[PDB]
Design a protein around this ligand. Structure first.
Ligand code: CLA
Ligand code: CLA
Ligand code: CLA
Ligand code: CLA
Ligand code: CLA
Ligand code: CLA
Ligand code: CLA
Ligand SMILES: CCCCCCCCCCCCCCCC(=O)OC[C@H](COP(=O)(O)OC[C@@H](O)CO)OC(=O)CCCCCCCCCCCCCCC
Ligand SMILES: CC1=C(/C=C/C(C)=C/C=C/C(C)=C\C=C\C=C(C)\C=C\C=C(C)\C=C\C2=C[C@H](C)[C@H](O)CC2(C)C)C(C)(C)C[C@@H](O)C1
Ligand SMILES: CC1=C(/C=C/C(C)=C/C=C/C(C)=C/C=C/C=C(C)/C=C/C=C(C)/C=C/C2=C(C)CCCC2(C)C)C(C)(C)CCC1
Ligand SMILES: CC1=C(C/C=C(\C)CCC[C@H](C)CCC[C@H](C)CCCC(C)C)C(=O)c2ccccc2C1=O
Ligand code: SF4
Ligand code: SF4
Lengths: 80, 139, 729, 142, 75, 225
């Protein structure tokens, strides 16, 4: 499956979490930003790689990246 | 086990396939306050029963799209929908929401996963980890 | 699933994509699972052995088929009137008309006509009978067997070379310069002296009697006593007839210069002295690098010593960078090979070496086009693999502040000035062409902007051409450069001043315009390749491109959209410009030489200054016989070329379907087809092992480019061969 | 004795033969004759058409030099007025709006001052504000 | 009158109005999809003709794809 | 009508059914599909859904229209070509006072229009003489335009074959260049969007092809009496 990595420039804006259509991301308490929350990717085995999370990130470049790796049935989005 | 009356639907050719009976399928359950009509993620419109409704789909993305439609396209907001994964062996795995709290909001008890302690500009050069089985982000 | 064994990520893919990518990444030994450097180098060594054996087998097959089904012994009796034969035709799908049409060149069956120009080569090097060709084919079979066994052998555990052996640059350079180049050239000179020259002078010499036939009347005495001039006395006179003893001299090493009066090719003795001299020079060069005796230079100290106050660190630590990176070496080799192939084409169409090959115009055109296309492909590959090196094997800290890292410091300036020069060429070249077209179309062809190629004509004069009347250097008899008593000058000046050869062809305004267009194409293709190679590491849009590999689809529609952002995509874009530039080059060469051969230089000179003349006098005019290969009234020998012409025009268009339409449409269509198959009775009994999916984005680009390039090459080859064969063949 | 392959159009038989049938470009019937007499000065090839020589010699300075200065002056004018207008706009608290909606007074004022663009350019280069320092320019990651 | 005797006029008129018609048909195919994306409301289209369009569309597309392939081959 | 008419009419049927397939798939699957279950939320005109699911380029209805424009062009080109050649070969011509009819192209349609080589040689190459040899006459404005048609078409391929990331990087370098001289524009230049790139490519493509055909037809028909 693909790998979703989140770096320390996240500001807890939750935009990446809301933009995720397959419910891969989540919010976990943190202490490095004002919101005291950081994104997390506990269910990367369901990610397809649509890059909506990257599209929604407001920080300079991205605090979240998706690297496409091994393709499974879930990752390839196959209904058959 | 899973309990619920299927919504009133005439059926369509965009429904399940052999994967559901061979690999896996998904189920979504929700309590509608009143009977109404909602758009099938597979095409067409279906009338959903008052009370508990249960629906089978082929992909998790379709189930979550239906859940988003339920949450955002009805004045009485449907917040109790649960999405499970159904294996051919009969085992039911509960998927969404993970802990009864929507991921859009922070809830104490979750464990950070996939979080790096460095900026994206501090990743190592490939030449330092070549001939290894890793990637610059993986290290 | 087992295949592919070298990548578990692909092997666990349920879709058919595993079948595709497994082929694509098959020969990428670096990214295989559990790959070490030593295993990488040993596998590459064996694979290179395999490619060498394949080359030898291909040459052996050419020789064998020519000997078996050709007319070599008949062709040597009349090289200017008999078509050489490539191989026989056995097509059960043929009809009576095709059988009658293709029975050509005096054969008794359907047969092809060779255009590789190998009959002339075999005639020139000495072989004259079919048994010699057969013996050569068998010997090449044996050589291929030996190299295959060597590849097997140096793979066994007792013979696998160590990593330190591979990274020995000095010994490799010494052996491959003194031995591979110098000794082979010396052996070729010995072959020419001992066999080729006597055979061309009528005296038959072979394995049976080369031990008792001295190539020169004075054997090894003048050579060893320093009286070398003896070997240059009594050359071949102007009345010499190739392959006979009429007018044949006895000199084995001369400096006649120019061309043979009869074969319109270089004298064989000139080739002998040339290859002998370069053999001596290469043998001297191969004793430069220190290996095991203390003496000799060491590359690292030479590289680290050539610093500079302006470039910073100069060439420091470049030795490690080049030695530890196979992609750097591959790019250097590919660039050098492409330049050398271009040189081969340019110096071989104008300085023919084989007898009676300048009179076979079709083979000359085919050879030029072939080797120029090969050179273009190699030059693209050099930049591609250099970009791969930048992505993978470039260490910024090791190369800190040297030339390699300093290139990336002013890369923006590079791309900016290269864009400016490309735009400057394109604007004012298309403007001149369109101006000439518009003014000619309005019935006033006298207002055309015609610029004389002054500098090129000055260069031609400096080399000795007296047509332009510049009277400079070798064209000036009073100058010192023409009064040095060089043995080649009387022959070279005679050859260049004749208008019967391609040696320094006369030029006009159309040649000026087309050379500047070729310059535009070269600079633009270089712009694409260089920009991709420099931005492969990263850019503003993607600061971390290196973390995403050399070839990746995109970064999604976010950040404004990132279609075609990988370096692989830069190569993909540059391939089209390479093909277009090669098309311009070959069109110019072919039209100019059609005018030269027919003697109607006036047509090209008048009509090449505006694009409508290119469209009408070259494309429309020379397609008359090609498209008439098969007709409602009958079929002639050009039928196969017309069919391949249409075949290329079809594959070229087919490539557009992958190049334009993209993945999602076909993915949804495949969804519908999957549903249809699953719901059909009597068909559900059969199910696919791999879930059918649409081709990936990068795979789609590659497939479209492949169909495009194949159609391009086939169409142009068919048109060129048919036009030249109908006009002159 | 240069251009031995080129001849003056005055004594070129092909040019002379084809010059009596020159088409009239404009409504003036003498345009063909004027073109025929004006093109007799240049050098013609065997095809009868005039050619241009740009080796640098001043005898043929009309072929390339005079038009070269003529074009360069205008191009410098345009570039300088555009650059100066852009720089002046850059400090108006909404440069983009004044980039789409042209400040016609300021635009024409900068237009009328472009004939001194070489002196202005050399003055800017000497003053050091023509070229920015490499440390002050955004650059992509290496 | 005299339109048939003027071959150029015949060819020009035919080709011109043919191209116009083709463009208009493509525009129909476009703005229909625009309507479907924007103005389609499933609530008021329960088990009508449009719903049964959206409910056996896969059979439509599959049979149409087959007929397209068959026509392409056998033509 | 003969064998050639049968083949061409069924070719027309094939092209029309294919164009209908493309446009109907665009309309039917506009709301959603198996690949993308919430397509309608993205809108009518969106470029893609990302490289996920293996790649989701051109899934919107707008992209279906963009793909159907090419097929409509191909079908209408074949239609007008068939009409022109058949009319020239078996209908138009001249009548002698004896009553005999001599057609423009001597009735070669029935024997040549059955092969692709026939279309290439006896229609395109044969009838393009009147437009390529138009220079120096009143018809020259057609010949120029003919070449113009052959140009923009090719030009369009530089939008359809490429993507916007490469152009964005090139614009970054050029912006650095203009920044060095302190002449960078206030309006930041950006490469065309994916949808805009596709639209520009298809527009210039159709323009070039249609202009080519118009010039060819006019120069041919104004020269056959
Ligand atoms: C129905 C059409 C048709 C067919 C089937 C053939 C068939 C043939 N023609 Mg032919 N021909 C045709 C039409 C056709 N022709 C027409 C219209 C003309 C013009 C009049 C000609 C003119 C012509 C000439 C002039 C010659 C032939 C020859 C041949 C033979 C070549 C032998 C061969 O293919 O093995 C070799 C097979 C290959 C080279 C394979 C190439 C294609 C594959 C796809 C490439 C491989 C890709 C990939 C690496 C494959 C992986 C491995 C694979 C097993 C999976 C073959 C019998 C030649 C002949 O008889 O000599 C033997 C010959 O000289 N033909
Ligand atoms: C005298 C000793 C010697 C010799 C003869 C060779 C010879 C060779 N080595 Mg080598 N090698 C040596 C010592 C030697 N090695 C040592 C000491 C080391 C260890 C330091 C190596 C390590 C080494 C490696 C690691 C590899 C080789 C390889 C090769 C082969 C490359 C193919 C090639 O270049 O030929 C073809 C090219 C030529 C003969 C010359 C090039 C053409 C010239 C430049 C221009 C064209 C001339 C002419 C115009 C063209 C002909 C025209 C005609 C057809 C009409 C070649 C056979 C490679 C291989 O795998 O081969 C098995 C390889 O990967 N070598
Ligand atoms: C490089 C390849 C090569 C090879 C294998 C040969 C081989 C041969 N040549 Mg030859 N030759 C060559 C290149 C070559 N030549 C070149 C480039 C020239 C310059 C034109 C000559 C000029 C030449 C002449 C003029 C004669 C030979 C002769 C001979 C034969 C015996 C004399 C000899 O070479 O012993 C050399 C023995 C030595 C002891 C030399 C010393 C060791 C050296 C330095 C190594 C022998 C078959 C002679 C012949 O046919 O039979 C007598 C003869 O008359 N050759
Ligand atoms: C000395 C020659 C040489 C060598 C050793 C390599 C070696 C390599 N290259 Mg390279 N390359 C070369 C020349 C070479 N290249 C040239 C000349 C070009 C310019 C076109 C390229 C362009 C290039 C690119 C763009 C890429 C590589 C990559 C690679 C690496 C792995 C992938 C690969 O090549 O295998 C896999 C190769 C294939 C799957 C090619 C199969 C395609 C076939 C040959 C097309 C055939 C067409 C068809 C049969 C025609 C039929 C005709 C019929 C109808 C008549 C590998 C290190 C890749 C990389 O980065 O990996 C690290 C990569 O992305 N190369
Ligand atoms: C005939 C087709 C064609 C043309 C004209 C161009 C032209 C250009 N390409 Mg392109 N390209 C093409 C096909 C073409 N390409 C194809 C098929 C590919 C493969 C995908 C590429 C791939 C490619 C790449 C990868 C790159 C280019 C680049 C360039 C530019 C380099 C400058 C140059 O060569 O001349 C100068 C330009 C011209 C002569 C074209 C201008 C001509 C017009 C007519 C001028 C007048 C404007 C006109 C009046 C406006 C009227 C508008 C109004 C009617 C609506 C230029 C804009 C490079 C670039 O951006 O360089 C900076 C670059 O990086 N192209
Ligand atoms: C290689 C390229 C090249 C370049 C860059 C030049 C450049 C020049 N040539 Mg030139 N020239 C060349 C090749 C070249 N030449 C060749 C190949 C020939 C042989 C035909 C000549 C023959 C030639 C002659 C006969 C003369 C020049 C002159 C000149 C100068 C003209 C000064 C001018 O107009 O500025 C003036 C700018 C402003 C007033 C502003 C100029 C520096 C002229 C010269 O020497 O002038 C001093 C001159 O009379 N050239
Ligand atoms: C009666 C006819 C008609 C009407 C009223 C509309 C109305 C509308 N269309 Mg529609 N359309 C039509 C026909 C029509 N269309 C046809 C025939 C097609 C097929 C090509 C389309 C394809 C189409 C698409 C694909 C889209 C619309 C959209 C729209 C909406 C407005 C946005 C727009 O296009 O404006 C802006 C208009 C332009 C930017 C056009 C300017 C550029 C054109 C293409 C240049 C044409 C060049 C010209 C032919 C030749 C010049 C040569 C040059 C050298 C001088 C609006 C509801 C858009 C939408 O979704 O809105 C809801 C949209 O995305 N239409
Ligand atoms: C006919 C071809 C004409 C077009 C070809 C390319 C045109 C581009 C030329 C631009 C000049 C590039 C900047 C020079 C690069 C530069 O100035 O580097 C500084 C360099 C001085 O070198 P150093 O002595 O620092 O060291 C040179 C080496 O010994 C190691 O650095 O200058 C030269 O070598 C000039 C020749 C470069 C070639
Ligand atoms: C000042 C200015 C600007 C900026 C200008 C800048 C920054 C310019 C920078 C230039 C640089 C850095 C380099 C320039 C190099 C120029 C060269 C190399 C000129 C070569 C000339 C040759 C080779 C002359 C050739 C022969 C000369 C001779 C006279 C005959 O013909 C024959 C012929 C054609 C051979 C702008 C862009 C901001 C705005 C403009 O309006 C003005
Ligand atoms: C990116 C990269 C890369 C690539 C690049 C390339 C590929 C390049 C190319 C380049 C090229 C491809 C070059 C070329 C060059 C050439 C030259 C430089 C030449 C010169 C010449 C001369 C100088 C000559 C002279 C003369 C004459 C003219 C005459 C008389 C004689 C004489 C000889 C004197 C690499 C991999 C490397 C590395 C990494 C990065
Ligand atoms: C060249 C190119 C660009 C770069 C092109 C750009 C930025 C367009 C530049 C247009 C200039 C500025 C104006 C020319 C067009 C005008 C309509 C001309 C108007 C002329 C009148 C005012 C007289 C892309 O952005 C792109 C994006 C996606 C796929 C392919 C491509 C692509 O091929
Ligand atoms: S969108 Fe970016 S900044 Fe916002 S929560 Fe997600 S990772 Fe953090
Ligand atoms: S290449 Fe395809 S998936 Fe990637 S950004 Fe472009 S349209 Fe979207």
């Amino acid at each position: 499956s693909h790998s979703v990595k989140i770096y320390d420039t996240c500001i807890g804006c939750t935009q990446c979490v809301r933009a995720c259509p397959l419910d891969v991301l989540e919010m976990v308490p943190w202490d490095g930003c004002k919101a005291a929350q950081i994104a997390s990717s506990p269910r990367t085995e369901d990610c397809v790689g649509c890059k909506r999370c990257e599209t929604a990130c407001p920080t300079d470049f991205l605090s979240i990246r998706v690297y496409l790796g091994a393709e499974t049935t879930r990752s390839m989005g196959l209904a058959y | 086990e899973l309990s619920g009356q299927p919504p009133k639907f005439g059926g369509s050719t965009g429904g399940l396939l052999s994967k559901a009976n061979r690999e896996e399928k998904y189920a979504i359950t929700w309590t509608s306050a009143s009977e109404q009509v909602f758009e099938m993620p597979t095409g067409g419109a279906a009338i959903m029963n008052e009370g508990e409704n249960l629906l089978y789909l082929a992909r998790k993305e379709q189930c979550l799209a239906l859940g988003t439609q339920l949450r955002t396209k009805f004045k009485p907001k449907i917040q109790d929908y649960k999405i499970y994964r159904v294996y051919p062996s009969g085992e039911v795995q509960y998927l969404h929401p993970a802990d009864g709290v929507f991921p859009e909001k922070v809830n104490e008890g979750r464990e950070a996963q996939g979080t790096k302690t460095r900026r994206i500009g501090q990743n190592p050069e490939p030449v330092t980890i070549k001939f290894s089985g890793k990637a610059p982000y993986e290290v | 699933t087992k295949f592919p064994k070298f990548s578990q990520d692909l092997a666990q893919d349920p879709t058919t994509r595993r079948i595709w990518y497994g082929i694509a990444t098959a020969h990428d030994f670096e990214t295989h699972d559990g790959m070490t450097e030593e295993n990488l180098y040993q596998k590459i060594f064996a694979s290179h052995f395999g490619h060498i054996a394949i080359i030898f087998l291909w040459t052996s097959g050419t020789l064998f088929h020519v000997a078996w089904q050709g007319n070599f012994e008949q062709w040597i009796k009349d090289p200017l009137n008999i078509r050489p034969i490539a191989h026989a035709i056995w097509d059960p799908h043929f009809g009576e008309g095709a059988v009658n049409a293709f029975t050509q060149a005096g054969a008794s069956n359907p047969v092809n006509i060779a255009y590789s120009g190998v009959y002339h080569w075999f005639y020139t090097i000495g072989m004259t009978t079919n048994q010699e060709l057969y013996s050569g084919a068998v010997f090449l079979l044996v050589l291929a067997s030996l190299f295959l066994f060597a590849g097997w052998l140096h793979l066994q555990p007792k013979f696998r070379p160590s990593l330190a052996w591979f990274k020995n640059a000095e010994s490799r350079l010494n052996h491959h310069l003194a031995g591979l180049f110098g000794v082979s050239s010396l052996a070729w000179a010995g072959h020419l002296v001992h066999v080729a020259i006597p055979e061309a002078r009528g005296q038959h010499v072979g394995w049976d009697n080369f031990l008792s036939t001295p190539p020169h009347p004075a054997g090894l005495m003048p050579f060893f006593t320093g009286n070398w001039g003896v070997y240059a006395a009594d050359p071949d006179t102007a009345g010499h007839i190739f392959g006979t003893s009429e007018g044949a001299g006895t000199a084995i090493l001369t400096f006649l210069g120019g061309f043979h009066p009869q074969t319109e090719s270089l004298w064989l003795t000139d080739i002998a002295h040339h290859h002998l001299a370069i053999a001596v020079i290469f043998i001297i060069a191969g004793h430069m690098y220190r290996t095991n005796w203390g003496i000799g230079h060491s590359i690292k100290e030479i590289l680290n010593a050539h610093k500079g106050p302006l470039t910073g660190a100069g060439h420091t630590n470049l030795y490690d960078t080049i030695n530890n990176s196979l992609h750097f070496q591959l790019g250097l080799a590919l660039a050098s090979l492409g330049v050398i192939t271009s040189l081969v084409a340019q110096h071989m169409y104008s300085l023919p070496s084989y007898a009676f090959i300048a009179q076979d115009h079709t083979t000359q055109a085919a050879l030029y086009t072939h080797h120029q296309y090969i050179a273009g492909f190699l030059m693209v590959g050099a930049f591609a693999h250099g970009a791969i090196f930048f992505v993978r094997d470039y260490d910024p800290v090791a190369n800190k502040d040297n030339v390699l890292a300093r290139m990336l410091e002013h890369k923006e300036a590079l791309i900016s000035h290269l864009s400016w020069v490309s735009l400057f060429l394109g604007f004012h070249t298309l403007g001149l062409y369109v101006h000439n077209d518009v003014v000619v179309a309005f019935g006033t062809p006298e207002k055309q902007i015609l610029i004389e190629p002054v500098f090129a004509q000055w260069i031609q004069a400096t080399s000795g051409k007296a047509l332009y009347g510049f009277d400079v250097l070798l064209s000036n008899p009073d100058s010192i450069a023409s009064t040095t008593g060089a043995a080649w000058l009387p022959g070279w000046l005679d050859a260049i001043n004749s208008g019967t050869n391609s040696l320094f062809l006369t030029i006009g305004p159309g040649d000026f315009l087309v050379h500047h267009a070729i310059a535009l194409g070269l600079h633009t293709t270089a712009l694409i390749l260089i920009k991709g190679a420099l931005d492969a590491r990263g850019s503003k849009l993607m600061p971390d491109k290196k973390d995403f590999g050399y070839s990746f689809p995109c970064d999604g529609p976010g950040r404004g959209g990132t279609c075609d952002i990988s370096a692989w995509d830069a190569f993909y874009l540059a391939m089209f410009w390479m093909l277009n530039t090669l098309g311009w080059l070959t069109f110019y060469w072919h039209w100019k030489h059609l005018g030269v051969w027919s003697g109607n230089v006036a047509q090209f000179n008048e009509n090449s200054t505006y694009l409508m003349g290119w469209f009408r006098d070259y494309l429309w005019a020379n397609s008359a016989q090609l498209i008439n290969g098969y007709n409602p009234y009958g079929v002639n020998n050009l039928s196969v070329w017309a069919w391949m012409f249409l075949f290329g025009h079809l594959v070229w268009a087919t490539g557009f379907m992958f190049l334009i339409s993209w993945r999602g449409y076909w993915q949804e269509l495949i969804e519908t087809i999957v549903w249809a198959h699953e719901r059909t009775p009597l068909a559900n009994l059969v199910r696919w092992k791999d879930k059918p999916v649409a081709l990936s984005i990068v795979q789609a680009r590659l497939v479209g480019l492949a169909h495009f390039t194949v159609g391009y090459v086939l169409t142009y080859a068919a048109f060129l061969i048919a036009s030249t064969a109908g006009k002159f063949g | 004795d240069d251009f031995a392959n080129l001849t003056p159009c005055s004594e070129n038989p092909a040019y002379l033969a084809k010059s009596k049938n020159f088409l009239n470009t404009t409504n003036d019937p003498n345009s063909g004759k004027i073109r025929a007499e004006r093109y007799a000065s240049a050098l013609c090839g065997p095809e009868g058409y005039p050619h241009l020589i740009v080796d640098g010699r001043f005898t043929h300075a009309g072929d390339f030099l005079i038009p070269s200065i003529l074009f360069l002056y205008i191009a410098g004018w345009i570039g300088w007025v555009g650059r100066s207008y852009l720089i002046e706009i850059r400090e108006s608290k909404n440069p983009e709006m004044q980039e789409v909606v042209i400040n016609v007074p300021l635009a024409i004022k900068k237009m009328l001052g472009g004939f001194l663009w070489p002196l202005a350019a050399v003055g800017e280069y000497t003053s050091g504000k023509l070229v920015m320092k490499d440390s002050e320019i955004p650059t992509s990651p290496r | 009158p005299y339109q048939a005797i003027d071959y150029a006029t015949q060819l020009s008129l035919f080709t011109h109005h043919m191209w116009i018609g083709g463009f208009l048909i493509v525009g129909a195919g476009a703005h229909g999809a625009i309507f479907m994306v924007r103005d389609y409301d499933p609530a008021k289209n329960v088990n009508n003709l449009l719903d049964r369009m959206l409910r056996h569309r896969d059979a439509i597309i599959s049979h149409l794809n087959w007929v397209c392939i068959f026509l392409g081959f056998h033509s | 009508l003969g064998t050639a008419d049968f083949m061409v009419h069924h070719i027309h049927a094939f092209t029309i059914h294919v164009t209908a397939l493309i446009l109907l798939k665009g309309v039917l699957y506009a709301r959603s599909s198996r690949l993308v279950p919430d397509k309608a939320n993205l809108g009518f005109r969106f470029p893609c859904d990302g490289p996920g699911r293996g790649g989701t380029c051109q899934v919107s209805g707008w992209d279906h229209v963009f793909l159907g424009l090419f097929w409509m062009y191909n079908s209408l080109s074949i239609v007008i070509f068939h009409f022109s050649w058949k009319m020239q070969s078996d209908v138009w011509g001249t009548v002698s006072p004896d009553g005999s009819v001599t057609h423009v192209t001597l009735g070669n349609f029935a024997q040549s229009a059955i092969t692709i080589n026939g279309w290439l040689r006896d229609f395109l190459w044969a009838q393009a003489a009147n437009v390529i040899n138009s220079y120096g006459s009143a018809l020259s404005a057609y010949g120029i335009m003919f070449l113009a048609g052959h140009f923009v078409f090719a030009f369009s391929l530089m939008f359809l074959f490429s993507g916007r990331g490469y152009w964005q990087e090139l614009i970054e370098s050029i912006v650095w260049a203009h920044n060095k001289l302190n002449v960078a524009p206030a309006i930041q230049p950006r490469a065309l969007s994916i949808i805009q790139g596709r639209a520009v490519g298809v527009a210039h493509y159709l323009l070039g092809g249609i202009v080519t055909t118009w010039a060819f037809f006019l120069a041919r028909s104004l020269s056959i009496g």
